[PDB]
PDB file of C-alpha atoms in Angstrom:
ATOM      1  CA  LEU A   1      16.951 -15.473 -16.849  1.00 52.19           C
ATOM      2  CA  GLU A   2      17.945 -18.906 -15.807  1.00 52.40           C
ATOM      3  CA  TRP A   3      15.757 -20.838 -13.039  1.00 50.98           C
ATOM      4  CA  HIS A   4      18.920 -22.108 -11.412  1.00 51.33           C
ATOM      5  CA  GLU A   5      20.867 -18.872 -10.658  1.00 51.46           C
ATOM      6  CA  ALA A   6      21.622 -17.493  -7.195  1.00 53.89           C
ATOM      7  CA  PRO A   7      19.627 -14.215  -7.330  1.00 54.08           C
ATOM      8  CA  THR A   8      16.738 -15.813  -8.884  1.00 54.20           C
ATOM      9  CA  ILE A   9      16.410 -18.369  -5.993  1.00 53.30           C
ATOM     10  CA  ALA A  10      16.742 -15.739  -3.325  1.00 48.95           C
ATOM     11  CA  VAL A  11      13.947 -13.716  -4.917  1.00 49.45           C
ATOM     12  CA  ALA A  12      11.771 -16.566  -5.338  1.00 48.31           C
ATOM     13  CA  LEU A  13      12.047 -17.700  -1.731  1.00 51.03           C
ATOM     14  CA  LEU A  14      11.430 -14.106  -0.676  1.00 49.29           C
ATOM     15  CA  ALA A  15       8.233 -13.864  -2.824  1.00 49.70           C
ATOM     16  CA  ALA A  16       7.206 -17.280  -1.322  1.00 50.86           C
ATOM     17  CA  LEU A  17       7.704 -15.516   2.253  1.00 48.97           C
ATOM     18  CA  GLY A  18       5.792 -12.686   1.116  1.00 46.50           C
ATOM     19  CA  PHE A  19       2.912 -14.762  -0.046  1.00 49.68           C
ATOM     20  CA  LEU A  20       2.943 -16.900   3.109  1.00 47.31           C
ATOM     21  CA  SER A  21       2.874 -13.672   5.314  1.00 48.08           C
ATOM     22  CA  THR A  22       0.101 -12.112   3.243  1.00 46.39           C
ATOM     23  CA  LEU A  23      -1.979 -15.466   3.654  1.00 42.82           C
ATOM     24  CA  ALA A  24      -1.315 -15.494   7.327  1.00 43.46           C
ATOM     25  CA  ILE A  25      -2.432 -11.934   7.634  1.00 43.67           C
ATOM     26  CA  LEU A  26      -5.611 -12.550   5.556  1.00 43.65           C
ATOM     27  CA  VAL A  27      -6.662 -15.484   7.646  1.00 44.30           C
ATOM     28  CA  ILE A  28      -5.789 -13.440  10.827  1.00 43.83           C
ATOM     29  CA  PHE A  29      -8.009 -10.589   9.685  1.00 44.62           C
ATOM     30  CA  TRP A  30     -10.849 -12.925   8.743  1.00 48.60           C
ATOM     31  CA  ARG A  31     -10.751 -14.784  12.026  1.00 48.64           C
ATOM     32  CA  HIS A  32     -10.562 -11.637  14.140  1.00 47.03           C
ATOM     33  CA  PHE A  33     -13.239  -9.581  12.421  1.00 48.16           C
ATOM     34  CA  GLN A  34     -15.849  -7.096  13.826  1.00 49.80           C
ATOM     35  CA  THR A  35     -12.973  -5.900  16.032  1.00 49.50           C
ATOM     36  CA  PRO A  36     -11.890  -2.222  16.409  1.00 50.41           C
ATOM     37  CA  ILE A  37      -8.560  -2.767  14.785  1.00 47.68           C
ATOM     38  CA  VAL A  38      -9.676  -4.031  11.454  1.00 43.18           C
ATOM     39  CA  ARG A  39     -12.601  -1.622  11.301  1.00 41.37           C
ATOM     40  CA  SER A  40      -9.933   1.226  12.020  1.00 40.30           C
ATOM     41  CA  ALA A  41      -7.686  -0.201   9.436  1.00 39.97           C
ATOM     42  CA  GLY A  42      -9.984   0.111   6.524  1.00 40.03           C
ATOM     43  CA  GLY A  43     -12.483  -2.690   6.737  1.00 40.59           C
ATOM     44  CA  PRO A  44     -13.161  -4.367   3.370  1.00 40.37           C
ATOM     45  CA  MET A  45     -10.568  -2.129   1.829  1.00 40.20           C
ATOM     46  CA  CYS A  46      -7.981  -4.020   3.880  1.00 41.09           C
ATOM     47  CA  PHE A  47      -9.079  -7.294   2.039  1.00 36.90           C
ATOM     48  CA  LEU A  48      -9.300  -5.635  -1.262  1.00 38.17           C
ATOM     49  CA  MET A  49      -5.683  -4.675  -1.101  1.00 34.28           C
ATOM     50  CA  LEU A  50      -4.624  -7.929   0.411  1.00 36.89           C
ATOM     51  CA  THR A  51      -6.065 -10.286  -2.133  1.00 37.00           C
ATOM     52  CA  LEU A  52      -4.539  -8.033  -4.826  1.00 34.84           C
ATOM     53  CA  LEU A  53      -1.088  -8.476  -2.895  1.00 32.10           C
ATOM     54  CA  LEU A  54      -1.745 -12.222  -2.882  1.00 32.91           C
ATOM     55  CA  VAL A  55      -2.290 -12.342  -6.582  1.00 37.27           C
ATOM     56  CA  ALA A  56       0.805  -9.972  -7.121  1.00 36.98           C
ATOM     57  CA  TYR A  57       2.864 -12.427  -5.136  1.00 37.72           C
ATOM     58  CA  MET A  58       1.423 -15.423  -6.816  1.00 42.32           C
ATOM     59  CA  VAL A  59       2.516 -14.344 -10.354  1.00 47.01           C
ATOM     60  CA  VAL A  60       6.064 -13.576  -9.439  1.00 45.24           C
ATOM     61  CA  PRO A  61       7.565 -16.658 -11.007  1.00 42.50           C
ATOM     62  CA  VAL A  62       5.776 -15.624 -14.288  1.00 40.66           C
ATOM     63  CA  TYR A  63       8.380 -12.843 -14.321  1.00 40.50           C
ATOM     64  CA  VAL A  64      11.318 -15.194 -14.311  1.00 36.25           C
ATOM     65  CA  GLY A  65      11.942 -17.572 -17.214  1.00 32.86           C
ATOM     66  CA  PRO A  66      11.982 -17.425 -21.045  1.00 31.62           C
ATOM     67  CA  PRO A  67      10.801 -13.970 -22.405  1.00 30.20           C
ATOM     68  CA  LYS A  68       7.072 -14.160 -23.525  1.00 32.11           C
ATOM     69  CA  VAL A  69       4.550 -11.687 -24.739  1.00 33.97           C
ATOM     70  CA  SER A  70       2.183 -12.658 -21.691  1.00 37.99           C
ATOM     71  CA  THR A  71       5.087 -12.092 -19.330  1.00 39.67           C
ATOM     72  CA  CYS A  72       6.075  -8.824 -20.779  1.00 38.62           C
ATOM     73  CA  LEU A  73       2.282  -7.571 -20.744  1.00 36.51           C
ATOM     74  CA  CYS A  74       1.849  -8.927 -17.057  1.00 34.16           C
ATOM     75  CA  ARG A  75       4.947  -6.987 -16.216  1.00 32.30           C
ATOM     76  CA  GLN A  76       3.005  -3.549 -16.055  1.00 32.31           C
ATOM     77  CA  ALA A  77      -0.370  -5.123 -15.978  1.00 34.11           C
ATOM     78  CA  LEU A  78      -0.355  -6.347 -12.227  1.00 34.59           C
ATOM     79  CA  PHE A  79       2.745  -5.270 -10.350  1.00 35.88           C
ATOM     80  CA  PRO A  80       2.548  -1.510 -11.037  1.00 35.99           C
ATOM     81  CA  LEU A  81      -1.264  -1.899 -10.602  1.00 34.18           C
ATOM     82  CA  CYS A  82      -0.685  -3.374  -7.141  1.00 31.49           C
ATOM     83  CA  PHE A  83       1.624  -0.579  -6.350  1.00 30.55           C
ATOM     84  CA  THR A  84      -0.853   1.940  -7.381  1.00 31.57           C
ATOM     85  CA  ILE A  85      -4.017   0.514  -5.696  1.00 30.34           C
ATOM     86  CA  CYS A  86      -2.156  -0.076  -2.528  1.00 31.86           C
ATOM     87  CA  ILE A  87      -0.793   3.488  -2.417  1.00 34.64           C
ATOM     88  CA  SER A  88      -4.275   4.950  -3.187  1.00 37.04           C
ATOM     89  CA  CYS A  89      -6.110   2.884  -0.776  1.00 38.96           C
ATOM     90  CA  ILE A  90      -3.435   4.010   1.975  1.00 38.58           C
ATOM     91  CA  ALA A  91      -3.877   7.713   1.014  1.00 38.60           C
ATOM     92  CA  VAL A  92      -7.632   7.342   1.062  1.00 38.67           C
ATOM     93  CA  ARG A  93      -7.639   5.840   4.401  1.00 37.87           C
ATOM     94  CA  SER A  94      -5.351   8.604   5.691  1.00 40.92           C
ATOM     95  CA  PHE A  95      -7.520  11.388   4.227  1.00 38.48           C
ATOM     96  CA  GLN A  96     -10.559   9.812   5.842  1.00 37.40           C
ATOM     97  CA  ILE A  97      -8.844   9.678   9.177  1.00 39.98           C
ATOM     98  CA  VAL A  98      -7.597  13.205   8.981  1.00 40.06           C
ATOM     99  CA  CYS A  99     -10.958  14.258   7.815  1.00 39.70           C
ATOM    100  CA  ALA A 100     -12.813  12.670  10.798  1.00 42.08           C
ATOM    101  CA  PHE A 101     -10.262  13.814  13.293  1.00 42.97           C
ATOM    102  CA  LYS A 102      -9.862  17.339  11.731  1.00 40.62           C
ATOM    103  CA  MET A 103     -11.241  19.574   9.155  1.00 38.05           C
ATOM    104  CA  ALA A 104     -14.808  18.129   9.709  1.00 36.59           C
ATOM    105  CA  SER A 105     -15.550  21.530  11.326  1.00 38.19           C
ATOM    106  CA  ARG A 106     -13.004  23.394   9.698  1.00 42.39           C
ATOM    107  CA  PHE A 107     -14.409  22.526   6.348  1.00 40.48           C
ATOM    108  CA  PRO A 108     -17.930  21.318   7.148  1.00 42.91           C
ATOM    109  CA  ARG A 109     -19.669  21.726   3.914  1.00 40.25           C
ATOM    110  CA  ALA A 110     -17.037  19.807   1.857  1.00 38.34           C
ATOM    111  CA  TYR A 111     -17.364  16.669   3.942  1.00 38.72           C
ATOM    112  CA  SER A 112     -21.129  16.522   3.192  1.00 36.34           C
ATOM    113  CA  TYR A 113     -20.260  16.422  -0.454  1.00 38.75           C
ATOM    114  CA  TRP A 114     -17.464  13.740   0.291  1.00 37.24           C
ATOM    115  CA  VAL A 115     -19.782  11.523   2.279  1.00 35.67           C
ATOM    116  CA  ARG A 116     -22.747  12.035   0.137  1.00 37.93           C
ATOM    117  CA  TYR A 117     -21.178  11.264  -3.310  1.00 39.92           C
ATOM    118  CA  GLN A 118     -19.385   8.117  -2.014  1.00 41.00           C
ATOM    119  CA  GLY A 119     -16.143   9.721  -1.811  1.00 43.16           C
ATOM    120  CA  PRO A 120     -14.091   6.733  -0.520  1.00 45.28           C
ATOM    121  CA  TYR A 121     -15.595   4.560  -3.180  1.00 50.04           C
ATOM    122  CA  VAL A 122     -15.187   7.246  -6.092  1.00 51.59           C
ATOM    123  CA  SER A 123     -11.645   8.442  -5.493  1.00 52.77           C
ATOM    124  CA  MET A 124     -10.288   4.897  -5.585  1.00 49.69           C
ATOM    125  CA  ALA A 125     -12.405   4.082  -8.716  1.00 48.96           C
ATOM    126  CA  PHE A 126     -11.134   7.279 -10.411  1.00 49.52           C
ATOM    127  CA  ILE A 127      -7.412   6.163  -9.486  1.00 47.39           C
ATOM    128  CA  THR A 128      -7.885   2.775 -11.211  1.00 50.09           C
ATOM    129  CA  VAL A 129      -9.611   4.132 -14.363  1.00 52.82           C
ATOM    130  CA  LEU A 130      -6.950   6.993 -14.718  1.00 49.88           C
ATOM    131  CA  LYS A 131      -3.968   4.603 -14.481  1.00 48.51           C
ATOM    132  CA  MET A 132      -5.201   1.896 -16.972  1.00 51.39           C
ATOM    133  CA  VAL A 133      -5.511   4.530 -19.652  1.00 53.14           C
ATOM    134  CA  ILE A 134      -1.784   5.705 -18.773  1.00 52.03           C
ATOM    135  CA  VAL A 135      -0.693   2.031 -18.988  1.00 54.97           C
ATOM    136  CA  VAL A 136      -2.107   1.081 -22.460  1.00 53.71           C
ATOM    137  CA  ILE A 137      -1.019   4.573 -23.746  1.00 54.26           C
ATOM    138  CA  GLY A 138       2.365   3.789 -22.260  1.00 53.38           C
ATOM    139  CA  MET A 139       2.628   0.564 -24.145  1.00 57.00           C
ATOM    140  CA  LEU A 140       1.541   2.280 -27.423  1.00 53.02           C
ATOM    141  CA  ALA A 141       4.936   3.932 -27.663  1.00 52.08           C
ATOM    142  CA  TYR A 142      12.247   0.814 -19.996  1.00 52.93           C
ATOM    143  CA  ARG A 143      13.220   4.170 -18.673  1.00 49.94           C
ATOM    144  CA  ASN A 144      10.699   6.570 -20.399  1.00 48.25           C
ATOM    145  CA  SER A 145       7.510   4.336 -19.898  1.00 47.33           C
ATOM    146  CA  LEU A 146       8.466   3.587 -16.102  1.00 47.17           C
ATOM    147  CA  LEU A 147       8.954   7.265 -15.662  1.00 49.62           C
ATOM    148  CA  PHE A 148       5.329   8.089 -15.938  1.00 52.29           C
ATOM    149  CA  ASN A 149       4.184   5.316 -13.649  1.00 51.33           C
ATOM    150  CA  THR A 150       6.844   6.186 -10.987  1.00 50.91           C
ATOM    151  CA  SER A 151       5.783   9.937 -11.333  1.00 50.88           C
ATOM    152  CA  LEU A 152       2.100   9.002 -10.658  1.00 49.52           C
ATOM    153  CA  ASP A 153       2.856   6.574  -7.907  1.00 47.51           C
ATOM    154  CA  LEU A 154       5.128   9.342  -6.147  1.00 49.09           C
ATOM    155  CA  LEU A 155       2.656  11.836  -6.527  1.00 49.46           C
ATOM    156  CA  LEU A 156       0.044   9.570  -4.800  1.00 50.01           C
ATOM    157  CA  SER A 157       2.605   8.771  -2.258  1.00 48.50           C
ATOM    158  CA  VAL A 158       3.495  12.523  -1.546  1.00 53.72           C
ATOM    159  CA  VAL A 159      -0.311  13.499  -1.376  1.00 49.29           C
ATOM    160  CA  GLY A 160      -0.665  10.658   1.272  1.00 49.45           C
ATOM    161  CA  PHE A 161       2.451  12.122   3.030  1.00 52.66           C
ATOM    162  CA  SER A 162       1.157  15.723   2.880  1.00 51.40           C
ATOM    163  CA  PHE A 163      -2.285  14.626   4.344  1.00 53.07           C
ATOM    164  CA  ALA A 164      -0.745  12.472   7.157  1.00 55.67           C
ATOM    165  CA  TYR A 165       1.737  14.963   7.906  1.00 57.29           C
ATOM    166  CA  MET A 166      -0.792  17.115   9.849  1.00 54.91           C
ATOM    167  CA  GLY A 167      -1.569  13.926  11.931  1.00 54.47           C
ATOM    168  CA  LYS A 168       1.431  13.139  13.986  1.00 55.24           C
ATOM    169  CA  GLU A 169      -0.308  13.462  17.153  1.00 55.03           C
ATOM    170  CA  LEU A 170      -3.261  11.052  16.054  1.00 58.53           C
ATOM    171  CA  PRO A 171      -3.631   7.939  18.167  1.00 59.01           C
ATOM    172  CA  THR A 172      -1.170   5.077  17.186  1.00 58.26           C
ATOM    173  CA  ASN A 173      -3.907   3.070  15.516  1.00 57.63           C
ATOM    174  CA  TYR A 174      -4.904   6.000  13.172  1.00 54.65           C
ATOM    175  CA  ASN A 175      -1.317   7.587  12.752  1.00 54.68           C
ATOM    176  CA  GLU A 176       0.549   6.258   9.743  1.00 54.51           C
ATOM    177  CA  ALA A 177       3.104   8.855   9.384  1.00 56.98           C
ATOM    178  CA  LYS A 178       6.146   6.597   9.917  1.00 56.61           C
ATOM    179  CA  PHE A 179       4.968   3.835   7.552  1.00 58.20           C
ATOM    180  CA  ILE A 180       4.207   6.490   4.898  1.00 57.48           C
ATOM    181  CA  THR A 181       7.492   8.110   5.162  1.00 55.88           C
ATOM    182  CA  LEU A 182       9.328   4.832   5.087  1.00 57.52           C
ATOM    183  CA  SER A 183       7.490   3.650   2.158  1.00 56.66           C
ATOM    184  CA  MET A 184       7.601   6.727   0.189  1.00 54.42           C
ATOM    185  CA  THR A 185      11.363   6.994   0.729  1.00 51.01           C
ATOM    186  CA  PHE A 186      12.072   3.444  -0.133  1.00 47.14           C
ATOM    187  CA  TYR A 187       9.903   3.657  -3.370  1.00 49.82           C
ATOM    188  CA  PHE A 188      11.584   6.869  -4.340  1.00 49.64           C
ATOM    189  CA  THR A 189      15.123   5.493  -3.812  1.00 45.46           C
ATOM    190  CA  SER A 190      14.468   2.268  -5.400  1.00 42.63           C
ATOM    191  CA  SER A 191      12.844   3.852  -8.373  1.00 40.12           C
ATOM    192  CA  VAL A 192      15.692   6.299  -8.720  1.00 41.23           C
ATOM    193  CA  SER A 193      18.382   3.712  -8.571  1.00 38.11           C
ATOM    194  CA  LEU A 194      16.513   1.624 -10.993  1.00 40.81           C
ATOM    195  CA  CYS A 195      16.128   4.361 -13.677  1.00 39.58           C
ATOM    196  CA  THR A 196      19.800   5.120 -13.336  1.00 42.18           C
ATOM    197  CA  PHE A 197      20.646   1.508 -13.628  1.00 41.69           C
ATOM    198  CA  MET A 198      18.668   0.914 -16.835  1.00 43.73           C
ATOM    199  CA  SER A 199      20.999   2.975 -19.019  1.00 44.65           C
ATOM    200  CA  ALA A 200      24.517   2.206 -17.755  1.00 43.78           C
ATOM    201  CA  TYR A 201      24.459  -1.635 -17.365  1.00 44.48           C
ATOM    202  CA  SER A 202      24.986  -4.752 -19.365  1.00 45.82           C
ATOM    203  CA  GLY A 203      21.385  -5.411 -20.340  1.00 45.07           C
ATOM    204  CA  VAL A 204      21.095  -8.753 -18.991  1.00 41.04           C
ATOM    205  CA  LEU A 205      20.282  -9.725 -15.245  1.00 41.97           C
ATOM    206  CA  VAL A 206      18.880  -6.235 -15.179  1.00 40.90           C
ATOM    207  CA  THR A 207      15.510  -8.042 -15.360  1.00 41.21           C
ATOM    208  CA  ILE A 208      16.458  -9.837 -12.002  1.00 41.42           C
ATOM    209  CA  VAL A 209      17.449  -6.493 -10.468  1.00 40.02           C
ATOM    210  CA  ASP A 210      14.056  -5.073 -11.465  1.00 39.01           C
ATOM    211  CA  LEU A 211      12.137  -8.002 -10.376  1.00 40.50           C
ATOM    212  CA  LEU A 212      14.040  -7.892  -6.846  1.00 40.16           C
ATOM    213  CA  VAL A 213      13.147  -4.209  -6.674  1.00 41.75           C
ATOM    214  CA  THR A 214       9.601  -4.639  -7.225  1.00 42.12           C
ATOM    215  CA  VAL A 215       9.273  -7.658  -5.022  1.00 43.50           C
ATOM    216  CA  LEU A 216      11.069  -5.743  -2.156  1.00 42.02           C
ATOM    217  CA  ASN A 217       8.542  -2.919  -2.880  1.00 43.62           C
ATOM    218  CA  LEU A 218       5.757  -5.148  -2.319  1.00 42.76           C
ATOM    219  CA  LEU A 219       7.139  -6.812   0.724  1.00 47.47           C
ATOM    220  CA  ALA A 220       7.634  -3.527   2.407  1.00 47.14           C
ATOM    221  CA  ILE A 221       4.118  -2.201   1.305  1.00 46.37           C
ATOM    222  CA  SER A 222       2.617  -5.135   2.755  1.00 47.25           C
ATOM    223  CA  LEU A 223       4.643  -5.724   5.916  1.00 50.98           C
ATOM    224  CA  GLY A 224       5.041  -2.167   7.046  1.00 51.18           C
ATOM    225  CA  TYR A 225       1.205  -1.616   7.035  1.00 56.27           C
ATOM    226  CA  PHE A 226      -0.162  -5.012   8.141  1.00 54.34           C
ATOM    227  CA  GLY A 227       2.526  -6.810  10.363  1.00 54.85           C
ATOM    228  CA  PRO A 228       2.246  -4.082  13.236  1.00 52.37           C
ATOM    229  CA  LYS A 229      -1.566  -4.559  13.292  1.00 51.29           C
ATOM    230  CA  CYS A 230      -1.644  -8.302  13.552  1.00 51.39           C
ATOM    231  CA  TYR A 231       1.276  -8.042  16.015  1.00 51.54           C
ATOM    232  CA  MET A 232      -0.954  -5.796  18.200  1.00 49.38           C
ATOM    233  CA  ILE A 233      -4.024  -8.092  17.819  1.00 47.22           C
ATOM    234  CA  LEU A 234      -2.356 -11.525  18.401  1.00 48.61           C
ATOM    235  CA  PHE A 235       0.134 -10.683  21.259  1.00 48.59           C
ATOM    236  CA  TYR A 236      -1.968  -7.942  22.828  1.00 48.47           C
ATOM    237  CA  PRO A 237      -5.715  -8.984  22.881  1.00 51.03           C
ATOM    238  CA  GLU A 238      -6.188  -6.589  25.759  1.00 50.46           C
ATOM    239  CA  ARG A 239      -5.324  -3.628  23.229  1.00 49.93           C
ATOM    240  CA  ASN A 240      -8.016  -4.780  20.796  1.00 50.64           C
ATOM    241  CA  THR A 241     -11.251  -4.047  22.728  1.00 49.06           C
ATOM    242  CA  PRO A 242     -13.997  -1.441  21.856  1.00 48.27           C
ATOM    243  CA  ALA A 243     -13.681  -0.032  25.322  1.00 48.86           C
ATOM    244  CA  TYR A 244      -9.915   0.532  24.777  1.00 49.36           C
ATOM    245  CA  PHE A 245     -10.613   2.215  21.422  1.00 48.98           C
ATOM    246  CA  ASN A 246     -13.136   4.536  23.127  1.00 48.29           C
ATOM    247  CA  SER A 247     -10.717   5.451  25.874  1.00 51.29           C
ATOM    248  CA  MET A 248      -7.702   6.096  23.490  1.00 53.63           C
ATOM    249  CA  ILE A 249      -9.773   8.319  21.150  1.00 51.20           C
ATOM    250  CA  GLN A 250     -11.212  10.031  24.456  1.00 49.38           C
ATOM    251  CA  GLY A 251      -7.653  10.507  25.800  1.00 50.30           C
ATOM    252  CA  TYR A 252      -6.495  11.927  22.464  1.00 43.92           C
ATOM    253  CA  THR A 253      -9.359  14.418  22.045  1.00 40.81           C
ATOM    254  CA  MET A 254      -9.566  16.012  25.556  1.00 43.20           C
ATOM    255  CA  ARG A 255      -5.945  16.343  26.424  1.00 42.43           C
ATOM    256  CA  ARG A 256      -4.831  17.514  29.840  1.00 43.36           C
ATOM    257  CA  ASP A 257      -2.403  20.016  28.050  1.00 45.89           C
TER     258      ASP A 257
END
């Protein structure tokens, strides 16, 4: 996996672009805090996923180079962990949104349990604990091991899709159906093509193909979820105001029909 070789240069510069974009989003969110947009994006959960994205982008060059047990361990230690944490956080936010906007009265008792047992902080913690057991047991035994991780990630993604599916009509700041569908489709097609390509291939430069697939997945899962928000709050400051959020939710709830 040579340092001077045309695909490796392109993925390296693309990872640098992703790192710079994530840094810009982090600084933008930190500067414009206590605003309706960031609080409606997840609050500290956004930072939790964003710094994890930063560290995932930083260790991309570790993938490329001479094989090393550190690199092979980090392959599944951080990048799939990034995918899983990001997907679980997005799905948890979608469930919270669809539970505040709907089924708070349809399923009243269940919401009391959900908010009384620290559901947002427990459903995320369970996901991390569950996956790390799968990761270590996976290494105990390219296609077979990745199949379990892709199945888990796709199950999480389809859970998020099925839960945001009922929320097409939610306001544009609480509706992420488009991003969820795009990211789920991209992850599914990339994983399927990759798994097909593991078997019928030469066996060399497949590492570069897999690295490019993972880096593109990270780039999409960061941009499609954060770029629109910072676009709104940098170019349309009028659209970032508590009065505007009040008016938008009020207009959604009591529709003229």
